[PDB]
Design an enzyme around this catalytic site. Structure first.
Site, short mmCIF file in Angstrom:
data_model
loop_
_atom_site.label_atom_id
_atom_site.label_comp_id
_atom_site.label_asym_id
_atom_site.label_seq_id
_atom_site.Cartn_x
_atom_site.Cartn_y
_atom_site.Cartn_z
N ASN A 74 -9.99 -13.63 11.34
CA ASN A 74 -10.46 -14.70 12.64
C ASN A 74 -11.70 -15.41 12.44
O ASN A 74 -11.89 -15.83 11.34
CB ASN A 74 -10.82 -13.52 13.86
CG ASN A 74 -12.23 -12.92 13.54
OD1 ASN A 74 -12.48 -12.23 12.48
ND2 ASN A 74 -13.31 -12.93 14.59
N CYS A 101 -14.52 -15.17 13.08
CA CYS A 101 -16.06 -14.55 12.57
C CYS A 101 -15.47 -13.66 11.42
O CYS A 101 -16.45 -12.97 11.04
CB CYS A 101 -16.47 -13.73 13.77
SG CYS A 101 -16.79 -14.44 14.98
N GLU A 111 -13.85 -11.04 10.73
CA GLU A 111 -13.90 -9.73 10.68
C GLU A 111 -12.70 -8.93 11.44
O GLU A 111 -12.48 -7.62 11.35
CB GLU A 111 -15.31 -9.12 11.66
CG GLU A 111 -14.96 -8.41 12.97
CD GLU A 111 -14.86 -9.60 13.87
OE1 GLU A 111 -15.12 -10.68 13.77
OE2 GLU A 111 -14.42 -9.39 15.08
#
Ligand code: ATP
Ligand code: ATP
Ligand code: TTP
Ligand code: MG
Ligand code: MG
Ligand code: MN
Ligand code: MN
Ligand code: MN
Ligand code: MN
EC number: 1.17.4.1
Lengths: 683, 289, 289, 683
Positions: D375, D377, D379
């Site tokens: 994604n 981020c 994670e």
């Protein structure tokens, strides 16, 4: 350097103070006896050629399967019986570099001019050998020229789409904006120029569901469309060309224009998307009276009235918009906006100018919709209904997105053969066939509009060539008289062919009953005014041809009332940029830019004289920049009175003249009934 | 029509020697042969010596005789780049690659070298011949300046670009590329100032100035061929360097608004890898016809 | 002992007016009286003229006559700042605050203003009187340059500083402070070069040079008084500005190694308030742990 | 300067050589005595408050209508009975500036912390008053924190979606690219961060309909996506954030990376589009052995094998690709590519690094698909299936697009309450409710994958805060022992809650039977290795809480075999940007960047010490940059062995260390089993 290149450059080497135009002819001979005949691929007979082109995925086998091989052989023999010769080197060069079919590695020439014409005619006829021969005779005589997409791609397996221009209406929603971007990429992939009306999109600083000052305006959508057209660039061959049209009463109209300023920042500047401005008569009236005008926020107007700002008449609703407190607006100076338009056109040739009221005062399909924008060449002016592209898993309300097929009459060849009627009817049939066989699976509104409107565009080329080769000055009243008579004849025979097609198919275009064709209003000026030539020279030019009178127009009006019209739109005069070279014709109805044009190809330079240029007609081939733009406006208005769609009208300006002169030309064009203005090219 | 645009491009290209760390070049320098190191040193000294003339005389003398405040400012900026940036950059490259005694000897050699001196003194001679209020003598000096900026430097630039395109001496090659990028714009700008003078002349005077430019180019070119063999035969590159000289001679001519003199040639791919209308208000009655 | 540190200081002070956005001054400008705006425009126009000549003529001519490539590099850089940065910044200010007609009028006003013409005549005359290899004519021009840098600019600088100190026209004021920071180091540097020449002279010659410097200062001072009254009487500040120019005259004398000439006075406290990462290759041992 | 701001800035003023940390508490009081209470709208009773909020379109009627007013009042009373006080000024400031509900004029405060918590609890419980009170006790004890979307928008009518992490698969077609652009715009409109996999897209210079050198590559698609994300920027509130992931064996990988270089031109660089690189084990093996690698043209591989390059295992496919003449490839140096990645991360922190085999060797749903990308981020690591978006009026093949549900445990608050099990189960229930109540009508694959996979992300935060307040260094082996035990218990109770939900509802996630949960492989390391603390200090920390043993894990494995698992994915550790302030916690499981952070709001300066920072624990609150990145990698791998998805793992580097050190950290992360590397923040 090649021998033909030297022979073509020998034109400018003057002999006894005169240009060596005849050397050009020699060049063509060289170009054929040293390059074309050696680089052509010859087969034992036509059967082997057709088989090789079919199995090697050069030709579609479906259109060739409608004819027995004897019929195809007869069509090809009819094409080659004319013994067509290119009179100039550049005509043959342009055909064999841009339109002749080559091998996969582009090392050899598979298609001659006669081969290409035969294939296009066989595609047009759709199984009719006699019709195929008629098309062959029409194109080999160069009376009619299918557009570059149609001429280049007809009957080819690796072809794109035969439609040149597409016009999209973009509704004010993220779903509609994304769908417009997708459709623009799809149509640029197909090779067509895409025009998008951004007037329905709400301006910058509008509310997206009760959170205010949230919209990016039309400039963000412009950037998205610019990137989409950059990405979809015909597989890297031709740069993706798009057009954005905005109403001059849109609040973003300045920012819109600021996309084309040479000092614009990168976050605002848009470079691959042409811009057009739609000017209602209200804006010109406000500028004339020097009264400060108001640009409007489309979303506030839509909320208050339930309709888009460009969906209704500004001439009657502008005061209601201004006096309505629930409508948001900004004060502008209409004269300052006009001066900004003139400055922008001087600097970059943008925006396109569309005089909305000039388009809609003679528009025959106002019941379907008013014409709110034009195409990338600013000559297509048709009714369009915006589409409601909804969320996924929801049915979309498919509107009408404009799309027409282009085809140009060669005025010199049409009048030399005294065949205005036959050429117009055959061209109308070919354009109808192109529309019928067009099916775009990724543009739903375009597909629906093609199926319903059945709109075609029949243009004209070699107006200035015909006038100069007949000793008529392009700015003279005799030239305007000729244009009036010729284009009245073209309109008459186009309407007659449309009504005949409607009769033979038993169907008209959608919503024809509300059109001015059905009510007979369209024929008013044709049943009361005589458009026969007022000058003896023009009448002699039209000798041997039956010029329709008011009685013929009355009979045609009765015929249309009885049978209807198959095509919502029939005539549109495209620029006809590169295909005019092959036809040995001046570009469109515009006057020539230069008598002899020097173009650089590869490391060589070539000179193309205007068709028929010589010592006796040197001054009749007056350059456009040296001409009075007011008389060119008069000519374009005279032609436009007989053209249902618009004309790509390029303004040819000198560097000495100011933006005030450009504004005066624009206002005279608006006064004379000019529908659209294409370009402001400065010498 | 052009000075403010060139002002912008010049000032936005501003840079300083300290920005490029040079010490990491010693990791490829140590692997070059004696002939390669010798050629590099000699080429570098050649560029240094010519660029000093341009900083001390060429740019300031042209700035002195050209009329126009904005042109004088651009020319001052270019002179600054020669003296404050380029000269320090060449010195930095030298001090990194050679010990003090080696630098002094190379400069002694190149200072006595016949082909370097011939071209250096030819250019300087034309700068010294400019006369107050005589635009013909100014034009001749501008031609000399364009030939230095856009042509004479390139027999020298070849070698650093050749290494730079191979992954060798990358730090000094980056510096040279920045210098070269400045000289390119200097040549184009001075070229436009020369064309302005040229266009003010009669047809006979123009033909005479063209003959001057071509004659000067020929003299410099024949000396460049000798200069080239003298430096590059020992590393086997002279044929390709000669193609690069002619290609850059053509650019210099185009800067002066003249046709190319030499046929088009392809360049060594390693070196390639290294390388308003008048606003008039509407007066009313323009809306009525 | 000093050129290298001046070189480093000058190049580290490099700036362009475009770094400062000026639209923030639009309102405090709009709010000034017509008298205040008039004085402000004229003051900056007088400064523009001085920098135009310092960049076009003063700094390049001194650079030509001073020996040593590093000294020349500093002087060339200072020259560039004068006309490519300082003089241009004033146009950035004018183009933001004033309509074209007011800009045109103020530049016409510099041409016809007798005090501004007199001071330009005097300073530029001395620059153009420099004779090659004649250190005395050079000294005289360097005194003139120090007086321009450290004294003459200050009748102009007063007003932007006076506003800056009240929190008015602070963006324009930021530009002016950068210009002033440059001129202060320019005046010191040229002062040190002048002292070099002065220190070579006999005591008798030194006595004459002090006479020259003091006579020139007094002549410039008397003209500056009339200029100051002409500009500042309409805004009520002439006496205050006069104190400021005397203060700065003493600084100019000190830059030349001379004792202060005017007595100390209290200056308006408002005006006083107005003052890539290193790269290593991967070893085969970095892939195992 | 306001009084609370002075009291906050008094922290840095040192008294007796010590920071005045306690003064921060006083600031909070001031921030509530002077500002919050004055600008908080008060009502005569909660009924009036709820009526005003519902009527003025602040809240939703549906979730409040599920309870009687007595139950809602009881939930609010339970929230207010805690008498919760923000311990630091920044906690209250961040809540009342970012999450507290304000009037339309943004000058008054409608929601306190207790009000927002009660509303979120009532939304979570979906009609259960006791469950709502349990959620209120969970959030007012600050044991669990719903993500910023859930916490901010739950129960609000004027809101975005509760999910803000979206992963899209883009198929190699113009229709799929346009649909991806549209879906990215729609999800950014909802307020979500969108990640797109571009590995299936064919590289630059590939064939489109058998015409050569036609594709623009993934860089043109990145430009389109960057424009789309710039346009869709949450109605002009936050900058549109998007991520693009490319496999390192894609040929465009250099040009991809070149989009983040400072020297890149305007037509190359994308500014609002984050980039991540997926690195299979084959690339690391090639770089380790210094063998020259090959970057492949995806379309040639697809034509040869019928599958996309990123859809097959490169470890077994690389040699076949190289030896296949019909697969087009380019020679590269893998060590040079690694150095380029390290240099780019030093300059800008990009790209994100995904170790494909590290993710997929423990992926439980490889049968559905292998995790091909992460994604925004870095994670979220889930199986995704690409969708085949066809032309108009043609049925699309809808695949699976990842969208997981975020929520973070506060490790300090959870462990001091000895409520790992209860907090994990309640957080799982809340995440399940939010996933079930999410319905996106413009992202078909996102909606389908949300309905089918039922994937949630349960994260943790305040790890470094908890360790520092307990006298444990973040790099110490005791800290890793605690992380191992705590996250093994979190995984145990998350799996238990998922199986309990599956048993209650009678349904598992789609294609669960093929997962390693169904086969029991997932529990292998849990039924053989005991994860009880090896240090007495950590065991005393876990005192009062039952630590699951191998027998408990065997029982859980049998329970999952009998009943299944409701969620395909349960745990993912998000960065937890601003919610860590409100919870007075350190961000994510990352070590703290600064002990006291200085921020500038408006024209005022503010100081936030790390939670619980004092003189005694000043040394234990070691800054992340001063820490050894190898030990941080060890801790993150220790946590990752109990997290099914990835962990947002930011590298913290000093300016002294070079790209060799960055590459060494990346290779040690790959060796230690790190799935993703988020950022390279240089001090
Ligand atoms: N201007 C031209 N346009 C088109 N084709 C040409 C042209 N000039 C030559 N060709 C082609 O090259 C051939 C060369 O023949 P050319 O025109 O010299 O005369 P020919 O051999 O007497 O025969 P013919 O004129 O009857 O074809 C032509 O037959 C024709 O196919
Ligand atoms: N640190 C804090 N965090 C949150 N709210 C606070 C804080 N300090 C004060 N408040 C708010 O201000 C009110 C006043 O609290 P104060 O410290 O004066 O005493 P109290 O006994 O808690 O008061 P009250 O009668 O309001 O309960 C609190 O009830 C609360 O609403
Ligand atoms: C989502 C979004 C919309 N817009 C603009 C462009 C569209 O023409 C316009 C309409 O967006 P819509 O898609 O119609 O948004 P909406 O339907 O949720 O809001 P409303 O009910 O008011 O119609 O908003 C932006 O400028 N930026 C954005 O990010
Ligand atoms: Mg809407
Ligand atoms: Mg495909
Ligand atoms: Mn130089
Ligand atoms: Mn130079
Ligand atoms: Mn100055
Ligand atoms: Mn100075």
């Amino acid at each position: 350097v090649p021998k033909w290149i030297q022979l073509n450059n020998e034109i400018m080497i003057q002999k006894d103070g005169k240009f060596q135009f005849d050397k050009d002819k020699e060049a063509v001979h060289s170009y054929f006896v040293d390059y074309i005949n050696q680089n052509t691929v010859f087969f034992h007979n036509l059967k082997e050629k057709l088989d090789y082109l079919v199995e090697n995925q050069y030709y579609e086998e479906e259109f060739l399967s409608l004819y027995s091989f004897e019929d195809i052989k007869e069509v090809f023999k009819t094409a080659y019986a004319k013994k067509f010769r290119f009179p100039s080197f550049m005509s043959a060069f342009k055909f064999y570099n841009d339109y002749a079919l080559k091998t996969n590695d582009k090392k050899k020439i598979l298609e001659r001019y006669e081969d290409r014409i035969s294939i296009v005619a066989l595609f047009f006829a759709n199984g009719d050998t006699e019709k195929a021969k008629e098309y062959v005779n029409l194109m080999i005589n160069q009376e009619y020229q299918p557009s570059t997409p149609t001429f280049l791609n007809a009957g080819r397996k690796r072809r794109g789409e035969l439609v040149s221009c597409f016009l999209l209406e973009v509704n004010d929603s993220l779903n509609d904006i994304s769908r417009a971007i997708d459709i623009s990429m799809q149509l640029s992939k197909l090779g067509g120029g895409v025009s998008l009306n951004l007037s329905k999109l709400r301006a910058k600083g509008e509310a997206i569901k009760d959170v205010e000052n949230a919209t990016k305006g039309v400039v963000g959508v412009m950037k998205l469309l610019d990137n989409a057209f950059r990405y979809a660039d015909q597989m890297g061959q031709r740069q993706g060309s798009g057009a954005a049209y905005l109403n001059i009463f849109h609040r973003d109209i300045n920012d819109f224009l600021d996309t084309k300023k040479i000092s614009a920042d990168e976050d605002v500047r848009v470079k691959t998307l042409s811009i057009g401005v739609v000017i209602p008569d209200k804006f010109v009236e406000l500028a004339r009276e020097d009264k400060a005008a108001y640009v409007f926020y489309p979303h506030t107007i839509y909320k208050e009235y339930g309709q888009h700002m460009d969906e209704m008449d500004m001439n009657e609703m502008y005061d209601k918009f201004v006096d309505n407190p629930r409508v948001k607006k900004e004060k502008i100076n209409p004269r300052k906006l006009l001066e900004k338009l003139a400055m922008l056109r001087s600097e970059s040739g943008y925006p396109y100018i569309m005089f909305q009221d000039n388009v809609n005062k003679v528009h025959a399909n106002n019941h379907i919709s008013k014409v709110k924008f034009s195409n990338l060449c600013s000559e297509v002016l048709q009714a369009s209904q915006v589409s409601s592209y909804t969320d996924y898993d929801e049915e979309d309300e498919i509107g009408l997105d404009i799309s027409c097929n282009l085809g140009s009459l060669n005025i010199l060849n049409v009048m030399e053969h005294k065949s205005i009627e036959k050429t117009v009817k055959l061209a109308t049939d070919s354009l109808t066939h192109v529309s019928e066989t067009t099916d775009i699976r990724n543009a739903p509104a375009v597909r629906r509009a093609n199926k319903a409107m059945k709109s075609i565009g029949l243009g004209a080329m070699n107006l200035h060539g015909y006038l100069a080769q007949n000793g008529i000055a392009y700015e003279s009243p005799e030239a305007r008289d000729f244009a009036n008579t010729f284009f009245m004849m073209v309109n008459f025979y186009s309407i007659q062919r449309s009504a005949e097609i409607a009769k033979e198919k038993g169907e008209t275009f959608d919503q024809y009953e509300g059109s001015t064709y059905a009510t007979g209003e369209y024929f008013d000026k044709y049943v009361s005014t005589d458009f026969s030539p007022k000058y003896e020279k023009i009448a002699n030019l039209f000798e041997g041809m039956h010029i329709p009178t008011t009685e013929d127009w009355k009979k045609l009006k009765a015929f249309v009332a009885e049978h209807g019209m198959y095509h919502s739109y029939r005539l549109c005069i495209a620029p006809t940029g590169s295909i005019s070279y092959v036809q040995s014709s001046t570009a469109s109805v515009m006057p020539i830019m230069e008598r002899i044009e020097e173009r650089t190809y590869g490391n060589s330079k070539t000179y193309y004289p205007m068709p028929g240029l010589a010592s006796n007609n040197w001054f009749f081939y007056k350059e456009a920049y040296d001409m009075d733009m007011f008389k060119v406006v008069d000519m374009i208005a005279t032609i436009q009175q007989h053209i249902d769609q618009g004309i790509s009208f390029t303004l040819f300006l000198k560097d000495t003249m100011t933006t005030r002169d450009l504004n005066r030309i624009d206002l005279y064009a608006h006064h004379r009934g000019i529908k659209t203005i294409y370009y402001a090219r400065t010498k | 029509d052009f000075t403010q645009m060139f002002y912008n491009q010049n000032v936005k290209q501003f840079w300083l020697p300290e920005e490029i760390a040079l010490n990491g070049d010693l990791l490829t320098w140590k692997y070059l042969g004696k002939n390669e190191q010798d050629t590099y040193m000699k080429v570098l000294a050649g560029l240094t010596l010519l660029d000093t003339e341009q900083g001390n005389t060429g740019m300031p003398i042209v700035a002195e005789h050209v009329d126009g405040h904005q042109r004088k400012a651009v020319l001052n900026f270019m002179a600054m780049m020669e003296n404050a940036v380029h000269a320090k950059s060449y010195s930095n490259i030298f001090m990194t690659l050679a010990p003090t005694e080696t630098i002094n000897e190379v400069f002694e050699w190149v200072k006595q070298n016949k082909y370097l001196q011939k071209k250096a003194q030819m250019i300087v001679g034309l700068y010294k011949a400019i006369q107050k209020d005589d635009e013909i003598s100014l034009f001749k000096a501008m031609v000399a300046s364009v030939y230095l900026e856009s042509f004479l430097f390139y027999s020298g630039f070849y070698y650093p670009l050749y290494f730079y395109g191979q992954g060798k001496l990358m730090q000094s090659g980056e510096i040279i590329n920045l210098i070269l990028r400045d000289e390119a714009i200097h040549g184009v700008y001075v070229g436009l100032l020369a064309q302005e003078i040229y266009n003010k002349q009669t047809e006979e005077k123009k033909a005479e100035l063209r003959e001057f430019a071509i004659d000067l180019l020929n003299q410099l070119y024949e000396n460049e061929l000798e200069y080239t063999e003298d430096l590059y035969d020992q590393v086997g590159l002279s044929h390709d360097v000669k193609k690069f000289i002619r290609y850059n001679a053509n650019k210099a001519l185009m800067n002066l608004g003249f046709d190319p003199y030499f046929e088009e040639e392809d360049i060594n791919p390693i070196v390639l890898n290294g390388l308003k209308a008048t606003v008039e208000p509407l007066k009313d009655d323009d809306f009525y016809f």
